């Protein structure tokens, strides 16, 4: 149908490569709200366009807010593809018809706990800032642990009050004794907290740090206080370009419209003009799959099978992509965990013992891993053999 594809980019994406189907291709640089409103109202007089695909190069998240608001006030579905417009927001509204791409906090938390399980790091804590949305993360973690095969060891949750005075906050920071630590904070507070912990000496090789995609901001902007080996997961898949994203969006829209045509023919409806609804795609594209890729959504608008990527900080001060996400499982390019002993130039880590043994009947009993839970029984120990 009549679909408009608008891209706000600084990266040079040209336009020529971009029963009744018509497509609109444009390139935009500015991102001020008046420009958005003016362009939307101008194109809304352009031959009754029902489809809107948008992406952004900037990293401002209010663009998605305004897009959702205008979609609600015009009853026209809008997509998020890139940048701040594709950032997953808190709670959409049934009045709105705006939809995004990428995963929420809960899916990424599940992926993080899967990663932790696959390395048998069963002792951890919980560090949370005053950043909004922390209590939902706490509740999801509490619900996830109690119905798991692992039986995780969780230390008491660390909650910050303000910009840490290092008077009573350090009291809680000292009690952190685990090797795995979970942190949920914004990028500005992360530098402060990490410098604080490095001064406290909790920046050892065994003191791993895990953070969601929120704290990992610009790929170019990399603070020096992040130790080489920070654990981060963000949906920024650099193997798939925005062209594939907008093509998949077009496929989603075409499939949804085609399938909604047969139940009711007169579905596609856009408002006449800015100045001066019964059957839609609002509750219809829950189930959808194009070319095998299950591009279905949730009841709150999220994706069903997103593309998450596990990234870490190499010694070259770069976010190094390591692990991707399969349909439901987790793949790891590096099965053996690298030590990353050199987070900075002041870290002479060298405490380990390479132990080699031989299969002896009463002393060294070699047994296969339990297939029921894919974990060695607690009275055994990990091992490997180059077979």
């Amino acid at each position: 149908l009549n679909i408009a594809v608008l891209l706000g980019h600084s990266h040079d994406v040209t336009e020529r490569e971009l029963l009744d189907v018509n497509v609109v291709a444009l390139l935009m640089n500015r991102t001020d709200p008046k420009s958005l409103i003016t362009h939307v109202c101008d194109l809304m007089s352009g031959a009754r366009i029902h489809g809107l695909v948008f992406g952004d190069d900037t990293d401002q998240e209010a663009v998605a807010q305004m897009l959702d608001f205008i979609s609600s006030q015009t009853f026209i579905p809008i997509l998020g593809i890139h940048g701040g417009a594709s950032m997953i927001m808190a709670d959409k509204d049934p009045t709105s018809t705006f939809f995004q791409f990428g995963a929420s906090i809960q899916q990424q938390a599940t992926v993080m706990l899967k990663i932790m399980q696959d390395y048998d790091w069963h002792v951890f804590s919980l560090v949370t800032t005053i950043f909004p949305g922390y209590r939902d993360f706490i509740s999801f973690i509490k619900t996830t642990v109690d119905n798991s095969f692992v039986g995780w060891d969780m230390q008491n949750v660390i909650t910050l009050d303000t910009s840490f005075e290092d008077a009573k906050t350090q009291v809680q920071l000292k009690k952190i004794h685990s090797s795995v630590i979970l942190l949920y904070c914004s990028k500005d507070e992360a530098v402060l907290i990490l410098s604080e912990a490095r001064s406290l000496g909790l920046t050892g090789y065994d003191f791993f740090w895990i953070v969601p995609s929120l704290v990992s901001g610009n790929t170019e902007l990399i603070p020096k206080e992040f130790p080489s080996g920070l654990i981060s997961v963000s949906y920024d898949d650099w193997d798939y370009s925005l062209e594939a994203r907008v093509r998949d969006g077009l496929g989603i829209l075409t499939t949804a419209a085609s399938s909604m045509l047969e139940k009711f023919s007169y579905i596609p409806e856009a408002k006449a003009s800015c100045y001066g609804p019964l059957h839609t795609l609002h509750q219809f594209m829950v189930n959808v799959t194009w070319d095998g890729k299950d591009l279905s959504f949730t009841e709150e608008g999220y994706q069903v099978h997103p593309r998450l990527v596990v990234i870490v900080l190499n010694k070259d001060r770069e976010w190094e992509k390591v692990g991707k996400w399969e349909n439901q499982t987790l793949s790891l390019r590096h099965a053996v965990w690298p030590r990353y002993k050199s987070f900075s130039d002041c870290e002479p880590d060298d405490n380990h013992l390479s132990i080699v043994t031989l299969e002896e009947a009463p002393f060294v009993i070699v047994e296969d891993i339990d297939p029921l839970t894919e974990t060695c029984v607690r009275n055994t120990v990990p091992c490997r053999k180059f077979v």
Partner: nanobody
Amino acid sequence: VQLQQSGAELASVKISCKATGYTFRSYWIEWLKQRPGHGLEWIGEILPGSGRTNYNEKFKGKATITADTSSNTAYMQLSSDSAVYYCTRSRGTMITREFTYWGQGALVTV
């Protein structure tokens, strides 16, 4: 696809436009005035599938367009002007928004 309309008239009136060549719930229907001495005008459009209606500012408040999904007929009511009338339908390929199928024409006079 062929179109048929009502007869001549001679207060208020109503003119029917019946479709017997396609699925009547898919395409818009537009009304035209062709009073002699000039080319033509444009009144409004109606979609039988959902009932969304748009009207021209010049003819706003004087012409009311309605449709019946059962008999596949189009009704346009002028209240309280002697011109030839036409009801038409686009080809459907869209964008061009041209007029291809034409009616017979109802001659109203006061």
